[PDB]
Symmetry: C2
Subunit: 306 residues, 2 copies
């Protein structure tokens, strides 16, 4: 069984990464379509040994495809995802646009793959922010074991918007709580994915002068005590996570290792407070994390619903 797939925003960095991930993950693609604006039309890419030509989204017949991956910015998704959906395409959307819609599932496949069933509400599934993906993958085993009462998290990214490959702010006027509109969005994404309005989330989204890749410092207040050693064991077993325990010798120092893996380290309890757990979570290639999450959604969608 093979499926027709579109990538919208195919000439952008995430869109290009999506093609690479579909190939690397050996997704059962029959025909691949690459969509962009008129200015990008005619550009060529190689996928599974075949040539694919970018075409204008304005001329595209959506009846050709089963699933579309969108990564061309929120306003274009706002316009085009309803149109693809109406044609019977299931859109996996890598923008902020549909993440907060009550009727649209927001999915991290290691955490809430059950939510994918709700694709039939609107023919759209929302891909979360890489920051939220990273954190939720790392926290889920802890949540499952002992519960989570409160998360305090600091995220770090470049001031310039570059560094997303790693290989070369407005106060929220409604909440009036001192958190920025980005920070509140993380709260809402986190609570949605956990499907748990009782989890308190307190983010600080920090811009750093110069930074390649993305990092988060995470403190969690658990509902039952848990030893750092236990959570390190859990994370080591968990899929998609690479745990770094630290090196005593040069030969024990490791590189990033994975293509799109959640890199975890500095795992430790609050001193004399074992219902407090601390960890840092890193993504070297931010785009590959986002793209991979989107493809994992498509894999499960195809498996259980097609």
């Amino acid at each position: 069984q093979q499926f027709n797939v579109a990538i919208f925003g195919a000439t952008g960095a995430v869109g290009e990464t999506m093609l690479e991930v579909l190939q690397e993950r050996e997704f059962p693609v029959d025909e691949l379509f690459l969509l962009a604006s008129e200015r990008s039309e005619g550009k060529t890419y190689r996928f599974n040994g075949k040539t694919v030509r970018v075409q204008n989204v304005e001329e595209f017949d959506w009846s050709q495809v089963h699933i579309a991956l969108f990564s061309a910015g929120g306003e274009l998704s706002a316009k085009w995802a309803p149109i693809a959906a109406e044609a019977g395409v299931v859109v996996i959307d890598n923008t902020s646009h549909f993440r907060y819609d009550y009727d649209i599932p927001l999915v991290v496949p290691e955490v809430n793959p059950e939510a994918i069933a709700e694709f039939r509400n609107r023919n759209i599934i929302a891909n979360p922010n890489c920051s939220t993906i990273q954190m939720l993958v790392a926290l889920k085993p802890i949540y499952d074991a002992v519960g989570i009462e409160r998360i305090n998290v600091t995220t770090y990214q470049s001031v310039s918007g570059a560094g997303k490959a790693g290989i070369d702010p407005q106060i929220d006027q409604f909440m009036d709580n001192g958190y920025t509109k980005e920070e509140m969005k993380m709260v809402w994404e986190t609570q949605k994915i956990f499907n748990d309005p009782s989890i308190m989330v307190n983010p600080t989204c920090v811009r750093v002068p110069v930074f390649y890749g993305h990092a988060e410092a995470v403190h969690v207040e658990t509902r039952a005590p848990i030893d750092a050693e236990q959570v390190m064991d859990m994370l080591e077993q968990t899929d998609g996570i690479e745990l770094f325990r630290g090196a005593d010798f040069p030969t024990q120092v490791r590189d990033a290792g994975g293509k799109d893996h959640v890199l975890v380290g500095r795992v430790r309890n609050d001193i004399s407070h074992h219902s407090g757990i601390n960890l840092w979570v890193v993504a070297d290639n931010v785009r590959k994390g986002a793209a991979t999450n989107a493809v994992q959604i498509a894999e499960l969608l195809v498996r259980d619903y097609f």
Copy 2:
């Protein structure tokens, strides 16, 4: 009344900063003596409109001095402080060496000026780590008002070379740091011990994360405080404006004198307070703190 003051480690950066702070604060100095090893002897500095020559510590008569400010490294304080103290000098030591000794006070004048009294034990007062000083001045009003149950703090260094490495997110995974058995570095534990000592409170839990990546302009700290009674971030923002030496910043662009910003409660948890603390010259902070101790010593003890 004027006092004879020595600086040991005069040619080091902190030593030079101490000279500058003594001058800027108009400390009542009779004679300033500048001390170092054989090699640095003969070097000159300007102080209070005078040329002062660096001399060898090995040949120095300590009976000349009332107060000495030390910042030549831990082993040298270990060597010279008991020697100076025996000669009747009150030593204010900038190193970590004496900080954790039960009979030596560790003093931040805004927080625990009472502890200076314990200088009579061994004629030594310990100056805290520059990052601990920075944090404790910001937390003191909060501590006084509602108390503090738990502090979680991250300290950041200021801005293949180290410069480039400090820009790579993968280095936030601390593969090559040396950890004590509880998962924390010596450096981080020192912060724990200094905080509990200065607040004179063995019950305050302290959880420090001391990092060299990412880096910010100035010396930044991110603090979460778990209080003993709820307090509004607006109350807290009021207190910090009505405290001298602290400057408050609003706006979501922070980190961007001691500066304090992003002050907010944990959502629906008002006994949680979050804030950033940024110092422009954290080394000058340490020097200033040491000179402040010397000031209270002169005023209240001499």
